[PDB]
Structures are given as C-alpha cells and as structure tokens.
Symmetry: C3
Subunit: 469 residues, 3 copies
Amino acid sequence: ATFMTEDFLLKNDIARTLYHKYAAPMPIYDFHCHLSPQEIADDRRFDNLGQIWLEGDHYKWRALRSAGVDESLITGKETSDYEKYMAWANTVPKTLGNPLYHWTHLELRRPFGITGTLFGPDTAESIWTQCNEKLATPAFSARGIMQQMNVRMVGTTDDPIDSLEYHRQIAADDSIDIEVAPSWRPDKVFKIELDGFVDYLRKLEAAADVSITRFDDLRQALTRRLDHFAACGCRASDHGIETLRFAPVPDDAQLDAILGKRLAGETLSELEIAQFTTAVLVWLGRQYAARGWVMQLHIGAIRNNNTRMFRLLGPDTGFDSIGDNNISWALSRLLDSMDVTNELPKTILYCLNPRDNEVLATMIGNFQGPGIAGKVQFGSGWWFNDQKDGMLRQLEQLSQMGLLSQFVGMLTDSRSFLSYTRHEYFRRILCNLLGQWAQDGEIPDDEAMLSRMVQDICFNNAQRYFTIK
Amino acid sequence: ATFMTEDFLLKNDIARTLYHKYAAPMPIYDFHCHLSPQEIADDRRFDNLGQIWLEGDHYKWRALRSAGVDESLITGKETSDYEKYMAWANTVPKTLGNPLYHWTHLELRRPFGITGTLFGPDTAESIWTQCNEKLATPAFSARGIMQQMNVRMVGTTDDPIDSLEYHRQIAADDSIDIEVAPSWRPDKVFKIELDGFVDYLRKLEAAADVSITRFDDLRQALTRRLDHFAACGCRASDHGIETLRFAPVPDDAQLDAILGKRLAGETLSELEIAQFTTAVLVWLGRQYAARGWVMQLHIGAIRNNNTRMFRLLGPDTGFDSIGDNNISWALSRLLDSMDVTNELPKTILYCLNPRDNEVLATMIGNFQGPGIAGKVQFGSGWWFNDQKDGMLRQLEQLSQMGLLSQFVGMLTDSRSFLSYTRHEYFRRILCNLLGQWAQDGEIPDDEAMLSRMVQDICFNNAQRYFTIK
Amino acid sequence: TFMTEDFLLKNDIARTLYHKYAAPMPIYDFHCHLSPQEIADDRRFDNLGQIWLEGDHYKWRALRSAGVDESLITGKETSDYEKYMAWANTVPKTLGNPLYHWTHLELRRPFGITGTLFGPDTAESIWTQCNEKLATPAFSARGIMQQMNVRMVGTTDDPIDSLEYHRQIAADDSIDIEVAPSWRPDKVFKIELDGFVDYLRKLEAAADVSITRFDDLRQALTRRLDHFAACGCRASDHGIETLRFAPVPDDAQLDAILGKRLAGETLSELEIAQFTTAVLVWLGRQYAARGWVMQLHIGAIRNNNTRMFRLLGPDTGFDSIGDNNISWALSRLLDSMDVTNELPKTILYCLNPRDNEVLATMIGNFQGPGIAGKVQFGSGWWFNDQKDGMLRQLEQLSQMGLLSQFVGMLTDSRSFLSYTRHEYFRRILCNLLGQWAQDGEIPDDEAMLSRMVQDICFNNAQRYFTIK
Ligand SMILES: [Cl-]
Ligand SMILES: [Cl-]
Ligand SMILES: [Cl-]
C-alpha cells in the first residue's frame, strides 16, 4: 500500500531495529568512487537539478535511450538542462522494477527532503524549483552534500600520470575534515595491446622523467609515480581488467623484446601480451604489498560496444556491458604468483558477471593471511550488479563461502554527489537479510552479535582494512 | 491445501486484482511459435487426446525416458495412441516439481474445462473419453482452440524455401480473423559448416529460381525469398545459433572463395566459417532493418547429443540441451557490425543458458534507438527456461538492467495447440511479481499505473513492436 | 528461536513430512571419504578437538579467513585444546556460513548439547562434556554410525588398494553396517600429472602386470576391477578438474602416447585428451557391463596456493571452484559410451553452480529404459552442499528432470560427525515440498508426498545402487 516509507525494504521487526538503530547512523567510508577531485576542492555549486543529477553514472542515459528518447535530449549540446530534465521526468514512470526508480526517490528524500510524492511529468516542475533553491545554498554544494550524507572518507580513482594537485589542496584545507584519498589505477600501463599504449607511455615518461625503452625503466618510472601517490595519501589501487590473462613471467630480455616490438608497432602474440601484462601486475602487486595498500581487481567488463556512438561520445558514456571470459585459472595463477613469495597484498576481488560469484567467493579462501581479518575480500555487487538482486546474490555467496562478519562492505563507485543513498540502499538490504535469517531461526537473534556485525560491515571493517598497517 | 485454484500462483491481493481484472482478459499476440501452418489452414480436427498432446513439444518424451519407459511407448510407430497416452498417465504422478505437472493441469482446465481432478492412472480413462468428445467439435479444432484462448495473432517459424501457400490460404479465408504471419528462419543458409549445406543451397536455388555460385548470387536469391515472405505478411525473422561466431566481413572475392571451396567439398577453416556466417548474418540484419522487421536471435543450444537415438529418430526429438560457449564478444561484434551504419533492426535476444541472463540484459542497453520503446529486447525465458524459476530469473534481470514496462512479453515457442496456457502461466507469474513488489512497498500501489503496465506486457507492447514503422 | 527441532521447517506440511517420514529413514551414504581402517578398528577419539577440527577443511579455511596463525590450525606443535580454543574464538564470526549450522547440528546429534551457542564463554564446558561422551563405546567411530542410523556407506578407494579393511568389516559379525568400496581411478587417466609414472609402477605391482602398451593397462585395470568386484564394489567415482575430449584413436596411437609419457617426453593437449578419453570410455564400458554406478565430479581447481602446498600438501583447504566450459566435452564423453549402448548408471556433479542447468538438461539426453533415472544430477557438491546450493540444485533438477527419482544426499566427508549433513538436507527438502504444497503448487496429499520423501531419503539410492 505505501511506497518507500522509512521502513523501505525492511520486512521484519529485527530488520527495522538493525537498520534504524545500528546501520543508518554509521558514517560512510566510500573507499572507491569516481568523484571529480577538482569539484571537491573547489566546492562546486550546481546551477540546477539536471546539472547535478542527469549524467549520474550513465544509468539514466541508458534508460532514456531504451525508452526511445532522442540523444539530443540526453547528451546533446543543443538542448537545455531543463529539457533534458523533462525528458527524464517523462521517463521515470517507465522505470518501475529498475533500481533507477528507487534511486530517484531515495535521492529526492536525501538530501533534498522531498517525500510522499512520485517523480513524473505532473511533479517535475515543482521538484525542479524546490531543488534549485536548495542547490543555491552552501549546505547543498559538493562538500555540503558530502557532509549532510555523513561521509567520512572517499577514495577517488586516479591515473599514475595525474598531478593530484586537488588532493593536496583538499588535504591542506582545514575547512574540510573529510579525507579525500587518491587511488592508483594503472590500467593503461598494463594493457599493452591497446592502440593508445605508446601515447600513454610517452605521457608516463614525461610524468616520471624516465626514458622508457627497457622493462626495468618501466619499473623505475612506476616507482616514482607510486611514490608520488604515497606522498598524496594513497592507500589503494584499482585495476579494470576486461581480458584477464596469465603467462609465467619471463626474464627481462624477453620483456625488453616485447616492449621493443610494441614500440616499433609490431603485432604482439597472445603469449607476449600475457607475459608483459602479468609481469607488470605481479611487480605492481609486490609494491602494493610492500606499501600496505589494498589491491582492487575489477574484472569482466566488455567496453565500447557501440562504434557509431563511441565515435560521437567516447568512452564511459553508457555503452559498456558484461563480459563472459573464463577466469578462475588466470586469476588463481596471478594471485599465486604474488603469494608464493608472501607478497600478496590485501586484495579485493570484484566480478562484473554474477555467474562468477561462487568462483570469487571460493577463490579468496585460497589466499587468506594471518594477523588480519579477511585479507582477501569478495567485493560488493559491482556496477550492473549494484542493485537488490545483485547484492543479495553477492551477499549470499560471501556468506556461504566466506565470512560475512569480516566484509569491508559497500562503496558507491560513482561520479555523482547524489550517490550516497546507494549506501542507504545497501544497508536496508543487509539489515533485511540478517533480520529475515534471525526471524526464521537460521541465526541467533542475539542483538549484541547482530549490532556488532552491522556496525562492522557498514563502516568499521572498511576503515580498519584500509589503514596502512 | 488446494492444488491449482483460480488464484494459482497469486499470493497477494494486488496480484489477484492485476491478474483477474487486467491480465486474464487480454488477447494473445503469440509472435513466435512452431505451429503447422497447414494444420491452421485445414483447421485440423484431432482424433484423440493422445494425438494432440503427445505429438510434441518433446518435454513429455524426455520425462517418459527419464522414468524408464520404453521408447516404443514414446515415439514408436508400433504402439497405439491410447497405449502411449496410458504410459503418460502412469508417468505424470512422478513429475511433481516439474512444470509438466502444471502444464498438464492448466491444459485440462483450459480449454477442456476439467478441474478438481489430478491426472494419473485412476482418472486417465474418463479424461480421455471426455476430451475426445470435445475434440470432435469445431470449438476444439486447431482454429477453435486458438479462438477459445483469445489468440489474435501468431508468428510461425518458416524456412526461406517454403512456399507459404497455407499462409496465403489463411489470409484469403474470411472465416478466420486470426492473423497468421510467417517468420523468416534462415539457419540453413548461414550454417555453412553443416553437411546438408549444399543440398539446401540447391533447394534455395529452386525456390528463388536463381543460380548460386558467388556470394552476390546468394544475396539475389535471398532478396527474392525475402520479398516473397514480405508479400505473405512476414514482419519477423529468427535465427537458431548453436555456435555464435564472429570475424570481420571480408570482401566479396574472399566470400566467393569460401563458397567455392564449400561447393567443391573442401574443408573450411574456422576463420572461413566465421567470415561466411558473419557476412550472411550482417547482410540479413541490414535487410531486416530496411524492411522494419524484428530480428530474433536464439543462442546456446547443444543439439543431437545422443548419436544412437539420432540415427533412429533424427533431429528435434528431445536429445538437445543447454550449451555453454562464451558469447559476449561475438554477440557484441555481430550487433555492432549492423549498428555501425545505423542498420541494426529491432532485435530480440534469447539465451538458452541462464548463466548468460545478465550478459544479455546488459548487452541490449548498448544498442537502443530513438522513436521506439525498447528497440532491443531481452526475450522471455526460452525453452528449458520457460518455467517459473527460469521466468522469474529472466524477469528479474530484465527489470534490473532494462525496462520491464517495454517488455514485448511471452510467446509459446510451441508446436502444440494446447500451449496457450503457457501465457496463462506467464501472466500469473508476472502479476504475482508486480503484486508482491507493490505490497512490499517497492513500487507504487497505483492501480492505473500497474494495470497499464500489465496490459502493455501482456499484449500492447508486442502489437506495437511488431508493427512495421 | 535458533535451531529448534523445527529448524528450517517453515510450515506445517514440512513439519509433518520431516518429523513423521524423513527423520526416521535410515542413511545410505553412498559416497564418502571415511577411513575404512578407522571403521574396522572402531576408532576411539581422545577429544572433541581431534574428531572435529580437521573435518573436511572447512574449519581451516574459516580460521585462516579470520586471521588465525597456521600453527593453531595445522601445526604439529600446538595442542588439540589450543586449536579448539582458536576455533571457539572463531565460531562467533561465522554467522551466515554453514559452519555455524554444522557446529550446532553436530553438538545436538550425537552429543545431546542444545540451547547454547558455541563460543569462548561455553567452549570449556562443551569440551569436558563431549570428552566424557567420546570416552564411551557409543561414541566410537562405529557407535556414532549406529546412533545416526547409518545402514550402508560407500568409501572412496584407489585401484591399487588392498581393501583389507573392507574384507575385515565384512567378516565381522559385531558390525551389520555395510561398508562397500568405490573405485576412484583418477591417477590412471590423468596422464599429464607428474606422479603418473610412479603411480603406474604401483599398479604394475598391484595387478602384477608389466604395463608397456595400452592393452596392458586394460589387463591391469581388469584384474583390479575384479578385485574390487569380489570385495563388494558397485560404484565408481572420477574427479575431473579439466574435462577433455578427443575421439579415441587406435591402439598404435595410444601405445605411442603412453610411450612418450614413460620416456619423460611432454605430451600435447590432443595426446592427453586422447589417452584420457580412451581410459574413461574403456572404464565406462566396464562399469556398464558390471552394473556399477559411474560418478563424475567435475570442476575443481586444486592446489592454488603454491607456498602452502609446499608446507602442507594437497587437500588442505586450498582448492576452489573452476570455470571451464564443459557441455561439449561432457556430451561427447557420455555419447562415446552410449553409442554402443554401453553408458552405465551415471551421476553427474558440477562444482560451479553456474553449470546447474547444463547438467540438469544434459542428463535428459541419455536416459534409459527399465530404470528410474539412469542418469542423475547429484546433490549440491562440496561448496554447494549448503542451504542456497542445495535449493538451487533441487530447483534445477525439479524443473528439468524428475525430483521423485532423485537418489538424494551423500556426505562426501571424512568425518564421523558428518551425518547431520543428511539431517540438514532432509529438512531443506521437506520444507521445499511443504512450501509448494501450502502454496497450491503441488497436491497436499500425504500419501504422495510421504512416498516421495522416503524415496529421496533412502529408497531411490538403495534401488539405484543395486547391481541388477
Ligand atoms: Cl545515472
Ligand atoms: Cl510436451
Ligand atoms: Cl571442517
């Protein structure tokens, strides 16, 4: 009868208590996101609701396209923000069942305080005006929203060649107590088979002041950049792996020969690509272990599927989807290559194809370590899987194959300042899961035990895990 | 507790209202099936219940074999319809949990009007006699059943070499107002690696009255057959793909060489097979786009697994199952090859292996288009997946990754006139899903919005989607 | 309340099915890894830690995940009580993990401990109580088997084994539980493994046959199969991590391959597939001729941690779920035996649940007459042997096959405390059937439902494993 009350997704008494008493009030340790550091440093003020909300994480764009809306009303420079907004307002009523319908109303509730009203053509104009007035105030600036949402720390995703000037600016600014840490994402460095590898390498050379012609030079350059990240507060790395490969690491003469061919423009064989890629990832893994950083592996996307649209809009514009390569063998050999010398760092594994949930949940158990709780983690439902069904399936496998109690938990993985309600969504789902289990007599209804678990999964595990020990 | 009441599968009050008030009265647009056009044209009168029930869809055959029944009582020319029917009667009580138990009772209920009776040895005799008396009347002929089940349109699956004479006969016959459209299924044309390719190509030559030596001759022959299909009311195509391949389309000289080699009995390399198959599929896709037809891709079957039985019974006799090749890369390249020139048609994708559900639900989002609600669709649970669990999983991924509101819906994919209860089954499941979401406060409990959605998924979406723009 | 007698039973029909029909049925643990010598000598356990800690390596994996030092897990240096306390400190961290259910299920049966959560505050008392019980005859290896109403077990043995403890148990009137050996010839067909030559020499000595050509291997295996037959065997098992297939070549090629292996030469993928397929097809025909059940356990990725393998060896908790594509090879392998109508009774198991539907539909391609479900889709295996895993396997079997003919549950365990896994399964099954009945999805007919419960809990397996 009532849509999205304050007990949204809470279907039993234990769930309501867990959520309202132990989960909801915990701060957010958003260890992995795609927020713009300059927007945080400059404390961006948004002109209107379309501007802060529309692009989001390209889910709206995908929904608009699916609904048949012309691209001019989605990414077009020839239409106003208000027009793009009305197009979205006409589309939301068509999203029932899609998490977009939930996110939209969660986001209008927090931080905008709009409740008891469905977003659509008949309410859009009023919602636009009310939100625009709020957006004109300091509390609703980029920093303001982060503070209202109780954000304690965020980990941005950055490239080795970045200056991290905005991170330093934020660190040096006492008017903001939220920690904004950069994260090392060297994708371009290990994907030697991609067309832009050489161009990127030249940028790395200038960034590190190293002439890169031998593999060892690459190690030198990467060490310099790793040192820069360290100095700017980096505690984690990330790796977007679309094609997970593995080949035992050959000697430097062979790695030099591979780099040489690539620089000359010669086609590399799969073996050579696997060899180079594995050499870099293993060397990087050892560095992360030595520095006490968390290594994140985001595996399985298939990107830029639409050539016509890629030519007009470029990457990360809503044309990426789920890949389906076999991965257990390569994953196992890759992790083991680091662990054999006891140089496997704290590691978080994410799979974009949920058919791999059990592979990952069991894979982490092969490489755990002493003195730390859950050294190797199976990450929260990622991207397309960051929704109710997706999260329930991830949580179920982590629970059955590992230890839910030691789960680092949720992260927004978002470039939007309105994404913090994704933590609320996750928390409600987790509390309902635990509540249902307890109510059904599948776990004790000992509130002391459950409250501790909820607090840990919602924040304490993450904060502890990301500490450079 | 009572088995299969009129509220079967409807577990909440909202579900009951949606189903009984809005879903049940909707007509059926069975846009993809395997019904015999000749049986529709001649308005076949079945002699008995065994005949109309046991000539297919092969699910019964598989259940009978699993129960240890001799093949002679399943497909044998030697046993009578009544003896085969009794073997089935003795087996139904062993099928609890299998959708066969549901179909059997749904079908006796509609169209036969038999309720409150479990089918098995004790009741089979009476049921046989009662159904035989009804089968002898016009309301229970092939067309009669379709009329009783409120079928307004059907899309049969036909080969390019087919005359379509029965489709013409039905079109010209004013005593039948149900539209029976043919669907273009050119499997044999693109599966160049199969033994019967050359014999098939000769039949295509005969049907088109075109000599085929070069790849361009194949385009000419196919163009003529496409026009024949268009003139007989075709608005759709279908493609059964067991081995989804991809290789960039080479120039005609290469395609001619591949065809030349094949016609000479020479063995083709995997690259050559991929090139030819891809060239045919891409060209066909473009033709479908230019004509405004829907393109269906049914991917993943592993066929004729039992050689001993294949030699005695041939293909499509219940020895096919779920395959598991990796498909995202080939699928992406194949669709993008059509979409790059903006020549991708309305497309529906189906996967036989549910592990690929999320791959497909997300793949469709990469290629949507303007002016149509859900240009690319993720099809209803197919074949083995056309059951409660399978459909709930397919619906969940479509809901989460796409827009359920634009879903074209259910299709029987059957050769049996008693398959329309599969729509009843789908509708009850859908209504219960929406109802449960509404009741749990996950979607608004707004009868105007929900009923419109139910009606759209039950019929309106398909009617609009299959209309040539 | 946590784990009452109605644990996992959410409706009245389920309660009736479980308490009145499932629970009283005896157990036919047709596949396990129990030590026959422990059964023969009726092993007496010194303490709770001893009988419980190693189990099936699930506890070791949880301990490592919790950050517990390896010396307190597998170290020969620390005591049983220290290891036990480490485990007591870890159990409260396992909510949501089946370990929490097993722990408490095992304490209830056979130990009689109820209404208390296992943790640091209750561990010492539990240790003392359980130890007093372990000191009595009723809690010896055989005693526990009799307490859990175990009627038959199928051990997992290697072709070169003597099976002397099987012959001893059979000759002993004090024990009426049947303990049959099962033939697991993994080392024979996995030619690519380093230890293949050394193993072959053990087979040569066991069968007293000089193995130089492929036909010699047939003779050697035939003698061993006969030995196993004379010792009561009626089932086989095959652990297949890399499911291969290549058409079986003639003996000249098979001889050449075997020759290259014995001479230390490296084999190609085709060569390995040829040899492996020829051995599996030959064995399959043998199983068919003898009326034995053929089990295929597919999809493990083993010994993933080199550093730990070097210190502890295999089966120490460092194996996980593989993910190779298997439908094509599985189909051609089964078809290679079925083409001459020589496919035996077969149970298929997949370690990766994404393959549930592949297996559930694959079995339907090779069913046979005069038998109820010749080819079976096995219960959730290993990692999948838990509530979610079992429910998913049951659902696919039900949707694509015939649940009524399911051979049912097996522990696949080396622990005498594993019989509660049967209890767990039975509760889950009864609740599933009960929920369907209550929702009007199946008839609420006690006669039909009870029959089905008893068949799945014991009758189906007893008939299925009968050689006839
Ligand atoms: Cl978005
Ligand atoms: Cl059928
Ligand atoms: Cl264990």
